[PDB]
Design an enzyme around this catalytic site. Structure first.
Site, PDB file in Angstrom:
ATOM      1  N   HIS G 135       0.896  -1.179  -0.007  1.00 39.61           N
ATOM      2  CA  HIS G 135      -0.073  -0.021   0.072  1.00 39.61           C
ATOM      3  C   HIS G 135       0.851   1.103  -0.018  1.00 39.61           C
ATOM      4  O   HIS G 135       0.171   2.441  -0.086  1.00 39.61           O
ATOM      5  CB  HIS G 135      -0.835   0.117   1.237  1.00 39.61           C
TER       6      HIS G 135
HETATM    7 ZN    ZN Z   1      -5.766  -4.850   3.309  1.00 35.15          ZN
END
Ligand code: ZN
Lengths: 48, 542, 79, 318, 182, 103, 388
Positions: G135
């Site tokens: 992320h």
């Molecule tokens: Zn996740």
């Protein structure tokens, strides 16, 4: 849509606003806004 | 057919506002604003279903760039100018600095919502954090103890002269420099921790033995606390985890009450009726007479709801004795008459085409019957695998030695080992109808008996009570009792089809009121196939 | 259980003042009345908790509430 | 039979809560005795706040005229612009008698703007905020909670009742549990028929997997299945769910390019001016409405069909 | 005191508000056309369009007053909280360059439109002579219809997602986090 | 954690207030709702001792006692309001009444 | 068939906890490794310990300021550290914990060591459970992820291999990798996750990349409660078509328990067999595969499924019996190596999956310091006493 759309005198329509439920009428005739009839004729000529 | 295409689109759209929006899109195409691809995309959702109209439009218009999605807006080249000293030519040609994604733009300045979890899942996650931080502190202390033990081993074999001067960099001669720092900061005070850290670093072999002793006793008491907490964690998670795994089953107690009602089934059959009618109106004028069909491959399932029914007869107290007797007799007779089974062959020990035109109460009774039938088919179809898994449940020997296996349901005899699962769950349903099972324990037995797959049997007593109450209205109502008498007269098991069912429909339409619903349930002797046709308000219009 | 002090609604306090013959009700009387009711409940319920803990019971009866109201000169009849 | 009473130990209490082990048992003898506001009334937003000692107004680090950074914040007392104007020079000593006219007399006869230049110093810095008469000619737009743009494209925020304590089955999601109420509209009680496939697809309670999710459009209340239009879940947070059947706000016609970000509607006052004269070849570039300065026309179905056929009959040769 | 704005400029201002607050798009400050050449071109066009009756003195006075007031008003009532970081780093770059930056060289005409939009509040909050107020209003309407005569070459709708120039750039995640956060 | 966020009647004030005073003074039923008061009672009791239950009649007695005490306090507050040449009550009047009462 | 597997463990990767009541947890990797050595898999495997990364080695995708910030992150002086906290979005959604620099360095070192071992031919399957962060952006931290070590591993693979494919199978898909490889044509990204009010909020059928990276980003939006059969039907044919058209030289697989049946912020209903048959199918191709782990907010299920992934990568079938380890009390009452699927609703209709498949097919039919750089240097670490 909007904040002022009424065939009769506008009352912030988005039915007669500010009145009881026993006053509705949905018959068909000619419609004119006239800015709430010149704001009820400048508030009855400033309370006559 | 260019002249008649527009009114065809007008009758297909129906709504005036959608027609005006289609006209706006079409004029946008007309004014050299919308190209061919966006028009194709627009008619993909507008007239996608009408294959003839879409093919005509594609042949008549003359159909033979980047996508630029909502996310990843292009940054200016000013933000691209960054030194980035770890980037070579390949990294420059493979990475883009002018495209960035940020989830608040996806949320449109409104945020995001998380998945709602049941309460037992929240206690399970709390249990997970409680177990995690305990042994995380324990093994962080263990790693620091190992590092200090290596240090003590290095102190054990050299003299005092180099013991007094043993300056070391941060890290204690290891690959990490902050595990021990966090350990001493957590064990000691905030302000004292930094000073004892500074001592250990610049003056080892004086504070290091007592630090190792303090860490050893802290690790010992932490391990004792973890050991005394592990038993409580295990026994509470034994009832927490399987309840947390049940998502629809926790709400099934209220969902089965709200959804297995008359008006919901009326809505769900009228939805299929209008779907069939307008789908055929789009496609082809004749309409099928079959919708919402059930398959009956097993004959003992009728015997199972018969057993549940006359178990429920002897349990309740709100009905009279001859009322109970006639209800049980009617429930047995309707099954023996509708499904062409001569009588019950289980009436000894170990117990305790044709068209049907009926009203809404018989419809709800038959829907409850088919729902319990489908639930028992879902139980029985996986029963040959569930029973094999339970009978071959290889218990761990180390868990048995440490007494870690779940014996919560084994004390009261709720275990399914050593017996068939279907007969055991039939007996469990019988006793749960009898009202001496402490129902949540029966939910737990179903949770760790079929791996949460038996969530539709959670309200078996409730649907049995609903079936009994709906079958009670078959004789109290005069119209329903007269309909049953006319079914006695009609059913003869003879080849007389398609010559008196019209008379049946006429006398039912004259017999039933205008507000009463109309049904056609067709049952076939071969393969035990059943079909229900919704013909509501299709006979009184003429 | 959180934010349960707002369960006593503003028109409930308005009706309680109407029972007392109050002509006009200010907008700041509701928080003060909620605080006074919270203090009174924190006294009476605590006294009933001590009464229940004395009798080795796990739920508090209406008789203990009557005793807790009686010991402070606010005796209640009918329970 | 959980026991958090005796098996909760003495050294370690409920996790996520320290105890007296780090304070009482921490003896190391190895060292051998050697007025302000919190609403930021310049942009109506939140963040790191700085305040004046004798002024209740608080500002941001960037909403200040010379934006200051927290890494090199000035020391000592800090003052606002009108704090320098009121508590400091031009008000306490050298009282304002005719220095305002002296601004014109000194700044080379800029009198039509010199008064505003002088009032700049007697004015706190703030972010830009749209005037009331600018907002009133567009009734479709409105001001948000912190003062962001909010037209009819953006949905209203959901309340906490529908978002946090919306029970378990509901969970503000229809992808879980059987939800037959989403397929029935309360206006008439009929069935919501999807636009692409003409089926409501309610299904049955015995077969929940046969049910297809449907949603109501936020503009024309047109039902739409979740499988027909490519979309995974519902649209509750963010903008209003616009079905792909209306007029888009921005289109692209590559030829560099034209955007045409609509006209976002004008209220029913005298600014909305109508003039239906010509039906063929108007080149009105859209912003039309259907009937049975910003110039708009009363176009109908016949005129749209006429110009569409004309354009595709000229364009089929190319 | 009442002021009218043509609906094209109001739509431009509303689109600017949408770009900043909703779309998170600041104006492209390194642009081709800035406020100084806007007022220079306006003054030259009105000087070469009409005759010479003595109004060029007040024309140059209005241009100089607008330039100075935009110079000293840019950080007071304009400049959204999103664009404050851009203004801060431009001021830091000018401080590193030992040069005194004025807003008429880099800022576009959208901020001038913002200033004309907030002008009635500024006039209503200040004590001004009547005739000077009407003269300022008349010059304001003259500049507004001059901008209305040249919308296409000056305010062109372009998307920064696919074009080098759009008089608007997209804000990054770091930029939005610093501006709309702390 | 992973988230980014014709003419109307037009009754004058005072007359309908006196109408409600006359209606509720001669009335008998309980003004405060049952479950909000019960939940407030449980929330207050959970601070003193957890896992505690209240019966329906105990909640009834607590509700009636609290209503009577608050009605008497409001009567004293209104009496102090008319005593202070006012018809609108103030929280300082409530504090004064509590101080005079000794609580 | 038979393939050598290199496992990368560090004993210091689990000693850092993000905070109290936190979804992300590096403590699961330690018990996963304990499950690996408790199963006797060391006799047919090679294990090395990767060194922590440096500032320059972690600057290969991120900026200099972000790397210097992450190296100088400290929770005690968080009061004045507020400008870079935002912008790098640290402390608001990703809180500050001790050892963040060390944890990022270990995760990156494991990632590029797996990439280097895949490049040099010393191993066929690289497993790095110490770091699977996806992320992380260029200068933004989200999803409790700080350094995008997967991007660095893909870059190190691209130094030797022409084409690298990234496969994501868990919820909360990695938008950082897609952002890093949105415009390049030599990198293809395929991910499976839930769309609609989900934390990332990125990834559509229209999102396939721009420029030279057009039609090179595959994103499959899914719904709640997807079972194993529909996950197989949405995984295996599209993976076979990706292998047929794109023909990658390396595979980066982000295994994790976020898509399992029990999860904190997850939404899927995959069991261990459903999560493992996809890995078996992607292993059956025979091309090298990189395995990273950065998902799973639950712990007891994620340890068992990581052990099952390791056992399937070891070309052996693990028994359901679970031996004694020091983390034995985490497991369920059955105490078997099996992630039990839940019974929640499978709203993922076959027609919607078929429409997504047709859109993906129509999109993909057009596809036919620096002194220690290049890695390939790790400690042995063969003396592991994690067996119990
Ligand atoms: Zn996740």
């Amino acid at each position: 849509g909007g904040r002022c759309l009424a065939f009769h005198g506008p009352l912030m329509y988005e039915h007669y606003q500010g009145w009881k439920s026993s006053w509705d009428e949905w018959v068909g005739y000619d419609r004119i806004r006239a800015y709430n009839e010149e704001n009820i004729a400048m508030k009855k000529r400033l309370a006559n | 057919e260019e002249v008649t295409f527009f009114e065809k689109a007008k009758r297909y759209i129906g709504n005036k506002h959608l027609y005006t929006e289609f006209l706006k899109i079409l004029n946008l195409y007309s004014q050299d604003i919308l190209d061919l691809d966006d028009l194709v995309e627009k008619v993909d959702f507008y007239l996608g279903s009408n294959k003839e109209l879409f093919t005509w439009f594609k042949n008549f218009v003359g159909y033979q760039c980047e996508a630029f999605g909502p996310s990843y807006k292009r940054l200016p080249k000013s933000d691209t100018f960054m030194p980035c000293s770890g980037r070579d030519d390949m990294c420059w040609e493979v990475l883009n600095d002018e495209w960035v994604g940020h989830p608040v733009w996806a949320s449109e300045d409104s945020g995001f919502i998380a998945h709602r979890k049941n309460q037992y899942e929240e206690t399970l996650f709390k249990i997970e954090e409680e177990r995690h931080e305990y042994d995380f502190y324990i093994e962080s202390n263990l790693r620091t103890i190992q590092c200090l033990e290596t240090i003590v081993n290095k102190i054990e074999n050299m003299t005092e002269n180099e013991k007094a001067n043993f300056k070391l960099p941060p890290g204690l001669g290891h690959t990490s420099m902050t595990i021990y720092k966090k350990v001493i900061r957590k064990v000691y005070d905030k302000e004292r921790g930094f000073e004892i850290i500074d001592a250990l670093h610049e003056h080892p072999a004086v504070t290091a033995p007592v630090v190792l002793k303090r860490l050893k006793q802290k690790d010992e008491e932490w391990r004792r606390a973890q050991r005394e907490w592990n038993k409580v964690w295990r026994e509470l998670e034994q009832k927490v985890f399987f309840k947390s795994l049940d998502h629809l089953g926790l709400t099934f107690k209220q969902a089965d009450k709200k959804l297995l009602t008359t008006k919901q089934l009326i809505s769900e059959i009228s939805s299929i009726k209008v779907d069939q009618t307008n789908k055929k109106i789009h496609w082809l004028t004749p309409k099928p007479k079959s919708q919402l069909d059930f398959d009956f491959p097993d004959k003992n399932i009728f015997y199972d709801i018969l057993c549940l029914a006359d178990t429920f007869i002897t349990h309740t107290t709100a009905y009279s004795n001859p009322d109970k007797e006639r209800l049980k007799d009617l429930l047995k007779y309707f099954i023996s008459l509708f499904f062409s089974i001569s009588f019950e062959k289980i009436e000894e020990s170990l117990y305790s085409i044709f068209n049907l035109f009926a009203n809404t109460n018989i419809y709800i009774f038959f829907r409850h019957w088919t729902t319990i039938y489908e639930r028992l088919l879902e139980i029985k179809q996986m029963n040959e695998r569930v029973t094999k898994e339970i009978n071959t449940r290889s218990t761990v020997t180390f868990a048995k030695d440490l007494d870690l296996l779940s014996s919560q349901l084994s004390e009261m005899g709720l275990d399914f080992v050593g017996e068939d699962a279907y007969k055991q769950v039939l007996r469990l349903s019988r006793r749960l109808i009898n009202g001496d099972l402490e129902h949540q324990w029966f939910e737990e037995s179903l949770r760790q008996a079929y791996n949460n797959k038996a969530f539709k049997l959670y309200t078996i007593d409730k649907v049995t009570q609903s079936l009994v109450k709906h079958a009670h209205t078959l004789m109290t109502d005069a119209k329903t009792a007269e309909i049953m008498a006319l079914f006695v007269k009609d059913r003869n098991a003879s080849t007389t089809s398609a010559k008196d069912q019209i008379i049946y429909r006429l006398q039912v339409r004259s017999h039933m009121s205008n507000t009463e619903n109309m049904f056609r349930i067709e049952f076939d002797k071969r393969t035990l196939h059943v079909s229900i046709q919704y013909i509501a308000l299709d006979d009184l219009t003429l | 259980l959180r934010d349960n002090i707002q369960g006593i609604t503003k028109p409930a306090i308005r009706r309680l003042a109407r029972r007392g013959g109050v002509k006009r009700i200010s907008g700041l009387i509701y928080e003060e009345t909620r605080g006074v009711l919270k203090v009174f409940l924190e006294n009476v319920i605590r006294d009933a908790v001590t009464y229940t803990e004395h009798a080795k019971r796990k739920t508090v009866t209406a008789m203990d509430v009557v005793y807790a109201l009686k010991r402070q000169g606010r005796t209640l009849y009918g329970f | 039979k959980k026991r958090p009473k005796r098996l909760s130990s003495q050294n370690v209490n409920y996790d996520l809560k320290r105890r007296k082990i780090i304070t009482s048992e921490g003896i190391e003898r190895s060292f051998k005795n050697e007025e302000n506001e919190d609403f930021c009334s310049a942009c109506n937003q939140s963040g790191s706040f700085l305040c004046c000692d004798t002024c209740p107004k608080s500002f941001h680090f960037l909403c200040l005229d010379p934006p200051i950074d927290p890494n090199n914040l000035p020391k000592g007392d800090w003052h606002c612009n009108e704090c320098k104007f009121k508590i400091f020079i031009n008000n306490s000593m050298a009282t304002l008698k005719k220095i305002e006219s002296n601004f014109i007399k000194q700044n080379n006869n800029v009198k039509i703007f010199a008064k505003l230049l002088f009032n700049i110093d007697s004015h706190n810095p703030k972010q830009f905020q749209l005037p009331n008469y600018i907002k009133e000619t567009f009734p479709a737009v409105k001001t948000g909670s912190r003062g962001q743009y909010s037209d009819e494209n953006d949905k209203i925020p959901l309340t906490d009742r529908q978002l946090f304590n919306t029970s378990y089955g509901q969970s503000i999601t229809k992808l879980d549990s059987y939800n037959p109420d989403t397929h029935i509209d309360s206006n008439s009680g009929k069935f919501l028929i999807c636009y692409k496939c003409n089926q409501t697809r309610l299904g049955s309670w015995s077969h929940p997997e046969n049910s297809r999710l449907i949603m109501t459009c936020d503009y024309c209340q047109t039902p739409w299945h979740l499988d027909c239009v490519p979309r995974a879940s519902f649209k509750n947070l963010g903008s209003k769910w616009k079905c792909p059947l209306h007029s888009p706000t921005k289109v692209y016609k590559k030829i560099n390019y034209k955007v045409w970000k609509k006209q976002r509607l004008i209220n029913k006052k005298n600014q909305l001016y109508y003039e239906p004269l010509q039906k063929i070849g108007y080149q009105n570039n859209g912003n039309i409405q259907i009937i049975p300065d910003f110039k708009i026309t009363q176009i109908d179905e016949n005129s749209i069909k006429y110009d569409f056929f004309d354009k595709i009959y000229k364009s089929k040769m190319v | 005191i009442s002021l009218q704005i043509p609906i094209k400029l109001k739509s431009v201002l509303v689109d600017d508000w949408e770009y900043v607050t909703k779309d998170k798009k600041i104006c492209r400050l390194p642009a081709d056309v800035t406020v100084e050449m806007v007022l220079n071109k306006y003054e030259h066009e009105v000087s070469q369009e009409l005759e010479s009756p003595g109004s060029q003195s007040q024309l140059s006075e209005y241009c100089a007053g607008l330039k100075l007031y935009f110079d000293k008003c840019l950080g007071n009532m304009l400049l959204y909280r999103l664009e404050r970081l851009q203004y801060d780093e431009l001021l830091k770059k000018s401080s590193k360059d030992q040069k005194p930056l004025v807003p008429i060289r880099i800022y576009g005409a959208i901020h001038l439109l913002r200033l004309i939009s907030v002008l009635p509040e500024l006039i209503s909050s200040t004590t001004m002579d009547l005739q000077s107020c009407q003269l300022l209003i008349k010059q304001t309407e003259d500049f507004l219809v001059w901008l209305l005569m040249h919308v296409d070459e000056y305010f062109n709708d372009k998307d920064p997602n696919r074009s080098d120039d759009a008089l608007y750039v997209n804000t990054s995640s770091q930029y939005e986090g610093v501006a709309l956060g702390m | 954690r992973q988230s980014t966020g014709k003419k109307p009647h037009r009754y004058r004030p005072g007359t309908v207030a006196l109408r409600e005073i006359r209606r509720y003074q001669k009335s008998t039923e309980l003004l405060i709702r049952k479950l909000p008061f019960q939940r407030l009672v449980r929330e207050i009791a959970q601070d003193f001792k957890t896992d505690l239950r209240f019966q329906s009649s105990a909640v009834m007695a607590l509700q009636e006692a609290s209503e009577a005490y608050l009605v008497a306090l409001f009567e004293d507050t209104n009496l102090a309001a008319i005593h202070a040449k006012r018809v609108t009550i103030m929280p300082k009047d409530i504090q004064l009444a509590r101080r005079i009462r000794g609580e | 068939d038979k393939r050598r597997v290199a496992y990368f463990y560090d004993a210091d990767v689990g000693n850092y906890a993000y905070g109290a009541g936190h979804p992300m947890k590096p403590h699961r990797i330690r018990m996963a490794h304990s499950l690996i050595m408790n199963y006797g898999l060391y006799k047919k495997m090679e294990i090395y310990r990767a060194k922590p990364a440096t500032k320059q080695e972690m600057c290969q995708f991120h900026t200099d300021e972000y790397i210097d910030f992450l190296s100088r992150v400290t929770p005690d002086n968080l009061e004045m550290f507020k400008r870079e906290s935002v912008k790098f979005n640290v402390g608001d959604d990703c809180p500050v914990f001790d050892g963040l620099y060390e944890y990022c360095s270990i995760s990156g070192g494991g990632s590029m060591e797996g990439a280097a071992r895949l490049n040099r031919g010393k191993c066929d399957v690289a497993v790095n459970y110490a770091g699977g962060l996806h992320h992380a952006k260029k200068s933004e931290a989200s999803g409790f992820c700080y350094l995008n070590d997967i991007v660095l591993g893909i870059i190190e693979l691209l130094r030797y291999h022409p084409r690298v494919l990234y496969i994501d199978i868990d919820v909360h898909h990695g938008d950082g990798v897609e952002e890093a490889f949105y415009t390049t044509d030599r990198v293809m990204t395929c991910s499976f996750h839930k769309y609609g009010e989900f934390f990332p909020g990125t990834g559509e059928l229209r999102d396939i990349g721009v420029g030279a990276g057009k039609n090179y980003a595959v994103n499959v939006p899914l719904r709640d409660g997807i079972d194993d059969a529909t996950y197989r039907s949405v995984f295996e044919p599209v993976i076979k078509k990706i292998m047929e058209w794109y023909q990658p030289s390396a595979v980066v697989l982000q295994c994790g328990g976020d898509s399992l049946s029990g999860d904190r912020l997850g939404c899927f209903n995959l069991s261990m067999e459903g999560h493992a048959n996809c890995v078996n199918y992607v292993k059956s191709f025979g091309i090298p595969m990189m395995v990273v782990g950065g998902g799973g907010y639950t712990m007891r299920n994620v340890a068992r499924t990581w052990c099952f992934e390791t056992g399937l990568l070891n070309n052996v079938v693990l028994d359901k019996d679970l031996p004694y380890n020091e983390y034995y009390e985490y497991y369920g009452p059955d105490y078997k190596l099996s992630v039990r699927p839940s019974n929640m609703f499978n709203v993922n209709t076959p027609e919607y999956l078929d429409k997504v498949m047709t859109n993906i097919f129509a999109n993909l039919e057009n596809t036919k310091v620096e002194e220690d750089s290049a890695e390939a240097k790790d400690t042995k670490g063969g003396s592991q006493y994690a067996r119990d």
